[PDB]
Amino acid sequence: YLSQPRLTYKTVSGVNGPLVILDHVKFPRYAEIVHLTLPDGTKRSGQVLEVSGSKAVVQVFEGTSGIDAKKTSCEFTGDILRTPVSEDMLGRVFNGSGKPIDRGPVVLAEDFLDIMGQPINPQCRIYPEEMIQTGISAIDGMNSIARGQKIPIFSAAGLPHNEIAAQICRQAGLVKKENFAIVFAAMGVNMETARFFKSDFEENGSMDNVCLFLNLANDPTIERIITPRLALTTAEFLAYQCEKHVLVILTDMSSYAEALREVSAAREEVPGRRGFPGYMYTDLATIYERAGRVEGRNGSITQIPILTMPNDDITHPIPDLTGYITEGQIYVDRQLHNRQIYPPINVLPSLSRLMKSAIGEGMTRKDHADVSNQLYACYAIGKDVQAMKAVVGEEALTSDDLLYLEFLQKFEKNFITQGPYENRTVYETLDIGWQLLRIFPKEMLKRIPQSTLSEFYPR
Amino acid sequence: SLQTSFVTLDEAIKITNRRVNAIEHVIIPRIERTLAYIITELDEREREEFYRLKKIQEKKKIIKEKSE
Amino acid sequence: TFGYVHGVSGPVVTACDMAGAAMYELVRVGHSELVGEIIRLEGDMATIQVYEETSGVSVGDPVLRTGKPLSVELGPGIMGAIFDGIQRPLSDISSQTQSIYIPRGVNVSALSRDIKWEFIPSKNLRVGSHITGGDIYGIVNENSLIKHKIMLPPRSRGSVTYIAPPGNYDASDVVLELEFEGVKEKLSMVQVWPVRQVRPVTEKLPANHPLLTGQRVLDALFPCVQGGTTAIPGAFGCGKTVISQSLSKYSNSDVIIYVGCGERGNEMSEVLRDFPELTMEVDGKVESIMKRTALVANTSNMPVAAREASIYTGITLSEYFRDMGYHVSMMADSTSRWAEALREISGRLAEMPADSGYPAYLGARLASFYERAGRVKCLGNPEREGSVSIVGAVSPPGGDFSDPVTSATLGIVQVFWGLDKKLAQRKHFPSVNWLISYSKYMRALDEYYDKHFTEFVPLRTKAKEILQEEEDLAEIVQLVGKASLAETDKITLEVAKLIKDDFLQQNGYTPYDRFCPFYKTVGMLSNMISFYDMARRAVETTAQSDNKITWSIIREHMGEILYKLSSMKFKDPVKDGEAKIKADYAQLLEDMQNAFRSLE
Amino acid sequence: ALVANTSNMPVAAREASIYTGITLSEYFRDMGYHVSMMADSTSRWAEALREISGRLAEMPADSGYPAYLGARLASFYERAGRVKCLGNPEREGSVSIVGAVSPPGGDFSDPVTSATLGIVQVFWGLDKKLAQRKHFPSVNWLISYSKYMRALDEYYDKHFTEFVPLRTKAKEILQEEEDLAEIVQLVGKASLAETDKITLEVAKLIKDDFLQQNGYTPYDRFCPFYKTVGMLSNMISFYDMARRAVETTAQSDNKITWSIIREHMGEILYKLSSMKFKDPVKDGEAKIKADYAQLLEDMQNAFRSLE
Amino acid sequence: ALVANTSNMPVAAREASIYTGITLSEYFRDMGYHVSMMADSTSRWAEALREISGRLAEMPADSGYPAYLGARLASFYERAGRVKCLGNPEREGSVSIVGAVSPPGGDFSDPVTSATLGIVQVFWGLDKKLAQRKHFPSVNWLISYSKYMRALDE
Amino acid sequence: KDRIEIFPSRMAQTIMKARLKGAQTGRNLLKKKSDALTLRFRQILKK
Secondary structure, X not given: OXXXXXXXXXXXXXXXXXXXXXXXXXXXXXXXXXXXXXXXXXXXXXXXXXXXXOEEEEEEOOOOOOOOOOOOEEEEOOOOOEEEEOHHHOOOEEEOOOOEOOOOOOOXXXXXXXXXXXXXXXXXXXXXXXXXXXXXXXXXXXXXXXXXXXXXXXXXXXXXXXXXXHHHHHHOEEOOOOOOEEEEEEEEEOHHHHXXXXXXXXXXXXXXXXXXXXXXXXXXXXXXXOHHHHHHHHHHHHHHHOOOEEEEEEOOHXXXXXXXXXXXXXXXXXXXXXXXXXXXXXXXXXXXXXXXXXXXXXXXXXXXXXXXXXXXXXXXXXXXXXXXXXXXXXXXXXXXXXXXXXXXXXXXXXXXXXXXXXXXOOOOOOOHHHHHHHHHHHHHHHHHHHHHHHHHOHHHXXXXXXXXXXXXXXXXXXXXXXXXXXXOOHHHHHHHHHHHHOOOOHHHOOOOOHHHHHHHOOO | OOXXXXXXXXXXXXXXXXXXXXXXXXXXXXXXXXXXXXXXXHHHHHXXXXXXXXXXXXXXXXXXXXXX | OEEEEEEEOOOEEEEEOOOOOOOOOEEEEOOOOEEEXXXXXXXXXXXEEEOOOOOOOOOOOEEEEEOOOOEEEEOOOOOOOEEOOOOOEHHHHHHHOOOOOOOOOOOOOOOXXXXXXXXXXXXXXXXXXXXXXXXEEEEEEOOOOOEEEEEOOOOXXXXXXXXXXXXXXXXXXXXXXXXXXXXXXXXXOOEEEEOOOOOOXXXXXXXXXXXXXXXXXXXXXXXXXXXXXXXXXXXXXXXXXXXXXXXXXXXXXOEEEEEOOOEOHHHHHHHHHHHHHOEEEOOOOEEEHHHOEEEEXXXXXXXXXXXXXXXXXXXXHHHHHHOOOOEEEEEEOOHHHHHHHHHHHHHHOOOOEOHHHOEOOHHHHHHHHHOOOEEEEOOOOOXXXXXXXXXXXXXXXXXXXXXXXXXXXXXXXXXXXXXXXXXXXOOOOOOEOOOOOEEOOOOOOHHHHHHHOOOHHHHHHHHHHHHHHHHHOHHHHHHHOOOOOOHHHHHHHHHHHHHHHHHHOOOOOOOOOOOXXXXXXXXXXXXXXXXXXXXXXXXXXXXXXXXXXXXXXXXXXXXXXXXXXXXXXXXXXXXXXXXXXXXXXXXXXXXXXXXXXXXX | OOOOOOOOOOOOHHHHHHHHHHHHHHHHHHOOOEEXXXXXXXXXXXXXXXXXXXXXXXXXXXXXXXXXXXXXXXXXXXXXXXXXXXXXXXXEEEEEEOOOOOOHHHOOOOHHHHHHHOOOOEEOOEOHHHXXXXXXXXXXXXXXXXXXXXXXXXXXXXXXXXXXXXXXXXXXXXXXXXXXXXXXXXXXXXXXOHHHHHHHHHHHHHHHHHHOOOOOOOOOOOXXXXXXXXXXXXXXXXXXXXXXXXXXXXXXXXXXXXXXXXXXXXXXXXXXHXXXXXXXXXXXXHHHHHHHHHHHHXXXXXXXXXX | OOOOOOOOOOHHHHHHHHHHHHHHHHHXXXXXXXXXXXXXXXXHHHHHHHHHHHHOOOXXXXXXXXXXXXXXXXXXXXOOEEOOOOOOOOOOOEEEEEOOOOOOOXXXXXXXXXXXXXXXOEEOOOOHHHHHOOOOOOOOOOOOEEOOHHHHHO | OOOOOOOOOHHHHHHHHXXXXXXXXXXXXXXXXXXXXXXXXXXXXXX
């Protein structure tokens, strides 16, 4: 351990935006944490983002308003932000700084883990081969969730992405026909959203297995880019040291990206698109890739990093770079929500990278893969027919086209529409698939071999 | 002359409305998407110019400080 | 407490010998005492952003350091006054100078010290008692409407050592002295609070009580709740005056704050001229609105720091009264003008721009601004409660919704009162679009509506269904002319018209329609929908064969009933009391149902 | 052999990973083996260069990337190639490079995609709008190209011969369908000639059954070349016979419109679509070639009964 | 008497060429002669200003041009007109200036086109579509203007 | 397909805006043609 007394400085050189620059510092350490006291007694903390000679640049989490130049007192902890973690953090509510806000005590650590974490050795990483039953046909059928998968929900402001995440928390089980520890990072949200989830977790009777980290819209913007790491660090303890299956949900990741963009501008870093740092991808990978199973240990981490798409732009850097890192996305939209369809999940632009391993003989039912692929073909064609008919008129369509409109209309109300408390099995979802696919004659079901149609199509 | 001058009107209307619908549902949306794309990309080019000019001004400031 | 000017590069002034200064502190630069803030610091030198023109500032000029950051001065005399965005009384500057200009470096105290206020102690406190932050130790009698409760400043506590007796005191005297760990603090009636800091509360509560505006539309169909946040489009022809006047005049809130951000001079004049002329009945007396209102005025040529700070000064004033247990409703005349001021400062500081040129933190600033609204449990032992509502408007260039400022705002506010110009051209007021407008508080208010009115909730659901169906039928009607149209659809179309004409439309220039009590709004809607349901049944239950009822038969048969439904808006609440209007509406329902009975 | 430098690993290591990979590839090339290395990113390497260049405070070029981005990509890709090796034993080897690129938004305009296209000789462009339809592999087939067509024409003539004219006809059919799709969207399939409707539907046949395949099945996981050209020959043979059927009858006393051949030969169209489900591991070359030969005979007999 | 300067000449001479030309023009103007000065290109002059502005490491404006581009073009363009000359003979001469803005396109956002349009009284815009159709001389005649109408009406 | 695929430029803005104005003018003129044909059609229908 660190037995040497820490040093305290009153040597602040200057302040420039969110960065407090100290001089006369003895052997500065990179990415070490500094605790500072303002002339009025206010205590704040920050991290050294640069060292050079006797100088060090400290980014202050709470902010730099009120930071003095002569009376400011800073001390260097001598290490990186290692945070206290314990098993009994489940059932506690913390803020974005890692401190409790539930009137309980501070964390009585079992160990101290580096918030930055470490990359998992790809040779010991074990490829996920188990499916989670979300109960939502729009997901379990056509975009299955594996245990250890990273699947964000791409959403847009005003859409019920909070209700879907809340639903998933209660009715997420297995298809092996199980209590997930949930770590929920509520960052960049209003009180009502955080209270909605907090209340739902108690309503579900599962609060003793839920760890919350809150960082609300009125909280500092710099803490908003460690909150995910605090959640994941706890998840890593629980999953990889105590073999507990953990579900980690990160609320609108766009508030993370916007908080990061503010830091990028302050540090004059090289922009990429829309003003975001050119290293945004690398930073996101540090957050997202803390997931998956590890060989030889019985734990897992599954992520659902829901994000809001600015202006419904699927090419915005936030959903774009996320799409490159995560194993696909669920994607909800306004065209379904504006018709009172719940959950408003649009399967067409969605995918699950681990879905192909998750389905089929030994996992769900042998026809799973065939039903999904044909439903995608029929749904997409129905959308193409609507694009045509909008111009040429119904009279210009033939029987081959009307069948896809019949499918499209029945698909959305039978397959996607469910309700907040409709919990379907994966087998029931496929059965529904067949009920819709049987709208077409065998010759049009071109994604399914006759070795499958001959068994399932007749019913 | 009613019926022979009438079905020809129904055909002329169907052809005209189909063209109008295409302008509304295909051609203009496509022009608007193109224009919005152009507007966004041009602001992206403006930003990278801002970055370089800002760094140039800072490098000049550093040179000036060294000279003092 | 003085430093010296080292150099001027424009609006940015570099100071030397200013070691003892904090970031975002306040300075008064030069012999004219120009207002500015310290942003960058290095060594014993500081970089000052000056709000006003720096012409004439010399090297060697003094710089006076003020310990408080940008802050709002809070105390008696705040009510009825018009302030600059950085809390400068415009009604005193124009009257203490006899000028028409705001003097450069003008230094007029936010609250005058020549007024002898009537102060009454709480009469519960004694010397030696324990007092904490948020506690009320006396009330100042300002006017007939709002009592100005004097609270202990937040982040202060201790044992009371002196209490002023009841009497006439000005804002420079000492009213209460308290001692904490041997440190004595002498407090006047005025407290100062940094404008960028959120005033603490005991707890933030859910918003359940409706905001009882006087309009039938923007209430029945699109509710707002005390403590909630909404957005209002701001276009020349949208008729935004109707909401501003209705909200400030007849609302069930206690205190109104109107915040300008950076509008056209003539637009600020219209607001400043209109407001003093507004009155409302209170205890049977007609009182000026300015006795329970405060206003912050900023034109487009005001210092950008004030235009940017105006929005935070307004809400700081709002929270100040929130902590008294009052319900406060603040309107930001244009948050787009604020965002413009914010972008200007970001540009001036050569910050990296983001979306459409706006600062990277635009969204964070709007989110943290709106988060400050809500119903709260106040500080202090009195266990009082209050709320702040925000009805800030948006006016993006071009009227588009793609602008990051309007897009971000709509993703934050829970109610959108979308207005339109087409309706105004058709002389239909209030000009509410209906199909664009929404409210996300409907669930929060279900408990209130169930407890007090019961039938309101299914009625507003049916009302939206009828109005939406009228839109859905529009294409069928255009291509048909109501010929190949179901009689049940004709009922929907004509009843939807009735709703649009004699319910959602409201004429505020008539004495009977100035304010529509809720019980009248639900009364009118109940009878219209009850008619709708009876008309649907009259057709559907007889539509089998031989002898069927049609809309033409219903309309011709009971034309007096359809007229009586239209006549309901003329029931003046000032002369016809609650019992009489309800009785007349009950009789209408009976006459209505009996008229349909004769058809079966 | 494989090198792992995952997204959440040190960003600087992304440059070392790329150079280590190609250096390993050259080592085996020198031993007389044919190496086909692939770096699944490229953009992540260029991204590392951008992040380092930023920390270095270098003057950036297009979209924040270093001015020398093109220099690094050019020298990387040029280490590919079939070579005569150094060494008295006279070995012959090769290194191929199949490099992915990750353009933001799918917009092929970033400095990395642009520079890459100026270096690589084969362009396998993918279309997000095809992937959304699960039309895998999501190859655009309109913007893609290969500059080795002429180089392999000799090979193809030596072993197959029939492949090259089939390749040409297939491209003409797909391009003609695109030329028609542009106007059909506006017309509504009202002004189409019967010869054009055949193109449109055969092009669909090619798109759905030939260009896409499910790589996670026992039958599409690997497609031996003899099967690809075999089933293509049948699809083109149908095109030519169907186009002839209408061309020889349009001026007669009965025109064989698509609706007549479609109803008359519906079993042939289903058989042609089934040609993918051949499972080359269970059913070998002999059965697949004989099966395709039978489909050709079935078509010819149905046409004789039609025309 | 022409002044010859090619694209491969030094950037400073490329800038000075215009000043040399107009100096000769004013010289003969002061003799009472009517002088007509034709420029081959003022976009090449603006290019020289952009190149030198960069080399001097001074803060640029739009598209890399110096913020004072308009001032340099105005200085050249305003050295023209019918004048009463100095000297006993009371003679009166004139200089006409014909500029030439090479069009990166028909978009008048072009910094050089825009600065020129704000100064020059007559603009003879050449349409791209008329050029493609080989209609000569190729003049748009809808986007062109001449501000000397009232002066010539007499 | 989704875009006309003209490289971003201020020239492209001018061309696209002129192209949009042309398309909108054609839409309105053809809509008037349709309305005129529809009225005549219905009149012919009445007779």
